[PDB]
Design a protein around this ligand. Structure first.
Ligand SMILES: [Mg+2]
Ligand SMILES: [Mg+2]
Ligand SMILES: [Mg+2]
Ligand SMILES: [Mg+2]
Ligand SMILES: [Mg+2]
Ligand SMILES: [Mg+2]
Ligand SMILES: [Mg+2]
Ligand SMILES: [Mg+2]
Ligand SMILES: [Mg+2]
Ligand SMILES: [Mg+2]
Ligand SMILES: [Mg+2]
Ligand SMILES: [Mg+2]
Ligand SMILES: [Mg+2]
Ligand SMILES: [Mg+2]
Ligand SMILES: [Mg+2]
Ligand SMILES: [Mg+2]
Ligand SMILES: [Mg+2]
Ligand SMILES: [Mg+2]
Ligand SMILES: [Mg+2]
Ligand SMILES: [Mg+2]
Ligand SMILES: [Mg+2]
Ligand SMILES: [Mg+2]
Ligand SMILES: [Mg+2]
Ligand SMILES: [Mg+2]
Ligand SMILES: [Mg+2]
Ligand SMILES: [Mg+2]
Ligand SMILES: [Mg+2]
Ligand SMILES: [Mg+2]
Ligand SMILES: [Mg+2]
Ligand SMILES: [Mg+2]
Ligand SMILES: [Mg+2]
Ligand SMILES: [Mg+2]
Ligand SMILES: [Mg+2]
Ligand SMILES: [Mg+2]
Ligand SMILES: [Mg+2]
Ligand SMILES: [Mg+2]
Ligand SMILES: [Mg+2]
Ligand SMILES: [Mg+2]
Ligand SMILES: [Mg+2]
Ligand SMILES: [Mg+2]
Ligand SMILES: [Mg+2]
Ligand SMILES: [Mg+2]
Ligand SMILES: [Mg+2]
Ligand SMILES: [Mg+2]
Ligand SMILES: [Mg+2]
Ligand SMILES: [Mg+2]
Ligand SMILES: [Mg+2]
Ligand SMILES: [Mg+2]
Ligand SMILES: [Mg+2]
Ligand SMILES: [Mg+2]
Ligand SMILES: [Mg+2]
Ligand SMILES: [Mg+2]
Ligand SMILES: [Mg+2]
Ligand SMILES: [Mg+2]
Ligand SMILES: [Mg+2]
Ligand SMILES: [Mg+2]
Ligand SMILES: [Mg+2]
Ligand SMILES: [Mg+2]
Ligand SMILES: [Mg+2]
Ligand SMILES: [Mg+2]
Ligand SMILES: [Mg+2]
Ligand SMILES: [Mg+2]
Ligand SMILES: [Mg+2]
Ligand SMILES: [Mg+2]
Ligand SMILES: [Mg+2]
Ligand SMILES: [Mg+2]
Ligand SMILES: [Mg+2]
Ligand SMILES: [Mg+2]
Ligand SMILES: [Mg+2]
Ligand SMILES: [Mg+2]
Ligand SMILES: [Mg+2]
Ligand SMILES: [Mg+2]
Ligand SMILES: [Mg+2]
Ligand SMILES: [Mg+2]
Ligand SMILES: [Mg+2]
Ligand SMILES: [Mg+2]
Ligand SMILES: [Mg+2]
Ligand SMILES: [Mg+2]
Ligand SMILES: [Mg+2]
Ligand SMILES: [Mg+2]
Ligand SMILES: [Mg+2]
Ligand SMILES: [Mg+2]
Ligand SMILES: [Mg+2]
Ligand SMILES: [Mg+2]
Ligand SMILES: [Mg+2]
Ligand SMILES: [Mg+2]
Ligand SMILES: [Mg+2]
Ligand SMILES: [Mg+2]
Ligand SMILES: [Mg+2]
Ligand SMILES: [Mg+2]
Ligand SMILES: [Mg+2]
Ligand SMILES: [Mg+2]
Ligand SMILES: [Mg+2]
Ligand SMILES: [Mg+2]
Ligand SMILES: [Mg+2]
Ligand SMILES: [Mg+2]
Ligand SMILES: [Mg+2]
Ligand SMILES: [Mg+2]
Ligand SMILES: [Mg+2]
Ligand SMILES: [Mg+2]
Ligand SMILES: [Mg+2]
Lengths: 109, 72
RNA sequence: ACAGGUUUGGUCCUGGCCUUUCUAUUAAUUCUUAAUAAAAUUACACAUGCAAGUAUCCGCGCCCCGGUGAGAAUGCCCUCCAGAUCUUAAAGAUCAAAAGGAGCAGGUAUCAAGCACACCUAUAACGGUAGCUCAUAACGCCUUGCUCAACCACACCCCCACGGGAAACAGCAGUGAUAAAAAUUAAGCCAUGAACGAAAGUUUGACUAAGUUAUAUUAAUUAGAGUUGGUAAAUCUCGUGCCAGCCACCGCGGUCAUACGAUUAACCCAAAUUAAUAGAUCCACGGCGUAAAGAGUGUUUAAGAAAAAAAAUCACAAUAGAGUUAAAUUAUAACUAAGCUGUAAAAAGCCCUAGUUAAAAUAAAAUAACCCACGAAAGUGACUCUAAUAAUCCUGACACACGAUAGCUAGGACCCAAACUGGGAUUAGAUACCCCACUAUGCCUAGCCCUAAACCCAAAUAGUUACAUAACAAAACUAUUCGCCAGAGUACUACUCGCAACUGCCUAAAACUCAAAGGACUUGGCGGUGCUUCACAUCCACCUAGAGGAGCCUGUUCUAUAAUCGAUAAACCCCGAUAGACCUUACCAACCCUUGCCAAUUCAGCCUAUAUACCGCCAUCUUCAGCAAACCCUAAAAAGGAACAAUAGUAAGCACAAUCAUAGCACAUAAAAACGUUAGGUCAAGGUGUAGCUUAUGGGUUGGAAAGAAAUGGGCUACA
């Protein structure tokens, strides 16, 4: 605006980033509650294998399992990361495949 | 056109008024409920001062009137 | 940033989100060796071993190094130095506590007031004033080491450690618990530094040299990871069929997927490669008519900006008083007639109605006004009189004073209007639009409430018409100011603060969700918009003859059958059929035949699935006038492109038209009728792309089908 205004208001500061689902950490350890299924948003349709998990942050969170096929039993321990899934509403947490109770999605050779 | 912004407002307002009619008395509670907190916090605010200024009693001729609950 | 992708049928514009670059942890997949740097989840709890000694006593040393970042908006910077120590023939030097202040210093104003935060007396601890801080952010709250040859802070916790919990590795190694986060219970004082020593010297988990770890660079001995729709380097065949799955953004999968999973080639990085999460980087010296943003209005404070000119008058409707009434309407009488009112049409309603003639109150102010004045704005236009329109004139608030309608409180008023409500219609319904009553309420006096599309969506005050077209609208801009705007919702919302409000006003967020949301335009299409002109078997009005009823014929649709297919709004229904007893025949039932028509073929043959893969032939708009290359123009182009006293259009082609045929004319009919549209019709005329069948979805023989409860389309024959 004017100079006195730009003086009184200071220069603009770049606002600190809002921490996401992982609350700033790269990954999270988690424990399974109930394996289940969700339906995608409109233009595309499927059914995605989801879990409900608890995080070492003591928060419960809905997360996504990548790949075709898996074994996920209650009380299994998992690792999770912050990939958001573009199909579904509100699932912000992927499960890392290959660690703990989820082994690398199997090969059919 | 810009009506399409107004439509939203118009609706959001209408849908609010309707709400505040059904909810009226629930609302009325929670308003007065907080006024009785206000007046209390207010009181404590001053009480704090006697006790901070070393006096035992509230100073002479102090009834500490109720502002928030003022009616009629 | 040298930018790039992403809003729409498309075009700009505005505007987020994302990609592309570099670093760091951690994870997944791989991993050969050295060298060098770096080593770290945790002020959670700690087993054990060590991290201060020296030295003729005494003395001196003993968080100094070393560790950590818990705390505190801490602090940076700059003054000024008490004290401690060192040197020394008394003054130098190094640290530097306290105490200060030029200036700089995290977020938040939804934390706006704090509550004695000041001074004066030098009298010698008493008296005297009534102050101080604060919108240039006081006082709060929230988060946090840092501005780095270092500085600040802590040392089990109770900011401080007398005392209290209680028995302390935030020294080196190690260890439980915790966390996405994993170095040796390692050797030496040999160098440096430190402590003591007169000294040799002694001690030192500081440090030195190692040990461990792809954490980062370097060198080679080491080859692997990710990608391949687009942004963005790079693809073939299968499988799968909106499923399994993938994507950072746009998106991919619904039978032929370069987007999935797996091959095949490539691409690019490479002892690393991807993924994740944090950073660096990243708004606005840009804007505010239509896009997010000029507050409803004025004045002043604080704070600022300044050559000269800058008070002239109502063409008369500011405001506040007090008085007054012309038209109309109403009470209420006098007559007179039975109706009067009311709509598209009615009904209900009223006849204490209607017309006429009289006539107060209340309310509202035709024409003038084709005027454009007065007020700060809201607002103000019947008449008269009284009072009367700030500032020698810049800007200015959260302060002050006003602020349409509606609404609230008390009292009056009540012609007419009228939310509500009750009748009446309309309607599927009609809580509405139409009708009829009647109320709060519009009116006055006094007090509140403080909101508007309070909009001319265009801030104030001086200027200029220079420069100049995003679009549209009211053409473009300086200068001084204040106010306001950082995607869209969420949200004129939740909590706060204040208000004569207590379904209120004002101030005004976040979770979450999305990759948009917006402004202006462009061609279409559409319109129970408006205007003109038509319809010639054609909508209406009109004429004739029929269909719907009856019997029958014949086609669909349903039921029934072991027993075809196709068509099925206009553009199906005596339709493919100008044609089914066997045949046709594609169907069902049984039986049978396997190089099984042909010159040759691990080959024939298939009325099997795709008409949404198609060619063929057609339907349809359509007796509609347009389609389309080649160019040319438009202060830009999505697109448009004519005016004949002509203004940017020219153009061969295909349509129409013209000619042909109906045996001469003419008209009439026939024919013709592009481009496209309907993914319109038909893989059963035939032919084909893709798929399937191959001792059968192939080829033969023998029979068998086509029954009517109905429902309906078209015909025929009648009813004389
Ligand atoms: Mg992902
Ligand atoms: Mg809404
Ligand atoms: Mg409340
Ligand atoms: Mg848009
Ligand atoms: Mg599109
Ligand atoms: Mg559009
Ligand atoms: Mg996006
Ligand atoms: Mg690691
Ligand atoms: Mg230190
Ligand atoms: Mg340090
Ligand atoms: Mg901290
Ligand atoms: Mg604090
Ligand atoms: Mg502060
Ligand atoms: Mg000092
Ligand atoms: Mg709040
Ligand atoms: Mg005193
Ligand atoms: Mg302490
Ligand atoms: Mg003690
Ligand atoms: Mg400790
Ligand atoms: Mg240790
Ligand atoms: Mg210690
Ligand atoms: Mg451990
Ligand atoms: Mg590490
Ligand atoms: Mg040692
Ligand atoms: Mg080393
Ligand atoms: Mg390396
Ligand atoms: Mg190898
Ligand atoms: Mg399915
Ligand atoms: Mg395929
Ligand atoms: Mg891709
Ligand atoms: Mg693939
Ligand atoms: Mg590496
Ligand atoms: Mg910039
Ligand atoms: Mg403009
Ligand atoms: Mg706007
Ligand atoms: Mg906003
Ligand atoms: Mg204005
Ligand atoms: Mg104002
Ligand atoms: Mg407003
Ligand atoms: Mg002044
Ligand atoms: Mg000037
Ligand atoms: Mg008056
Ligand atoms: Mg009169
Ligand atoms: Mg009269
Ligand atoms: Mg009358
Ligand atoms: Mg009428
Ligand atoms: Mg009647
Ligand atoms: Mg007029
Ligand atoms: Mg006017
Ligand atoms: Mg004046
Ligand atoms: Mg002023
Ligand atoms: Mg008002
Ligand atoms: Mg009123
Ligand atoms: Mg009334
Ligand atoms: Mg009266
Ligand atoms: Mg009335
Ligand atoms: Mg009614
Ligand atoms: Mg209807
Ligand atoms: Mg109507
Ligand atoms: Mg009445
Ligand atoms: Mg009024
Ligand atoms: Mg107005
Ligand atoms: Mg307006
Ligand atoms: Mg406005
Ligand atoms: Mg102003
Ligand atoms: Mg002025
Ligand atoms: Mg100029
Ligand atoms: Mg344009
Ligand atoms: Mg927003
Ligand atoms: Mg409002
Ligand atoms: Mg509100
Ligand atoms: Mg306020
Ligand atoms: Mg006809
Ligand atoms: Mg016709
Ligand atoms: Mg008939
Ligand atoms: Mg008949
Ligand atoms: Mg049939
Ligand atoms: Mg049947
Ligand atoms: Mg059919
Ligand atoms: Mg068909
Ligand atoms: Mg058809
Ligand atoms: Mg026929
Ligand atoms: Mg037959
Ligand atoms: Mg057959
Ligand atoms: Mg089909
Ligand atoms: Mg077709
Ligand atoms: Mg075809
Ligand atoms: Mg033509
Ligand atoms: Mg053209
Ligand atoms: Mg002829
Ligand atoms: Mg002719
Ligand atoms: Mg013809
Ligand atoms: Mg012709
Ligand atoms: Mg079709
Ligand atoms: Mg059809
Ligand atoms: Mg065929
Ligand atoms: Mg073929
Ligand atoms: Mg057979
Ligand atoms: Mg037969
Ligand atoms: Mg019939
Ligand atoms: Mg007949």
């Amino acid at each position: 605006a004017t100079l006195n205004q730009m003086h009184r208001l200071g220069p603009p500061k770049h606002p600190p980033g809002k921490m996401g689902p992982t609350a700033g950490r790269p990954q999270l350890k988690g424990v399974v509650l109930r394996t289940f299924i969700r339906k995608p948003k409109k233009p595309n349709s499927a059914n995605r294998k989801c879990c409900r998990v608890r995080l070492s942050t003591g928060r419960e969170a809905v997360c996504f399992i990548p790949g075709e096929g898996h074994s996920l039993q209650e009380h299994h321990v998992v690792l999770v990361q912050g990939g958001r899934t573009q199909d579904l509403p509100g699932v912000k947490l992927t499960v890392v495949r290959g660690k703990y109770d989820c082994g690398h999605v199997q090969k059919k050779k | 056109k810009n009506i399409l912004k107004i439509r939203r407002r118009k609706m959001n307002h209408h849908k609010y008024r309707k709400l505040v009619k059904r909810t009226r008395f629930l609302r009325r509670k929670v308003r007065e409920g907080r006024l009785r907190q206000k007046q209390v916090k207010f009181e404590r605010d001053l009480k704090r001062i006697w006790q901070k200024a070393g006096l035992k009693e509230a100073p002479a001729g102090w009834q500490t009137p109720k502002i928030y609950l003022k009616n009629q």
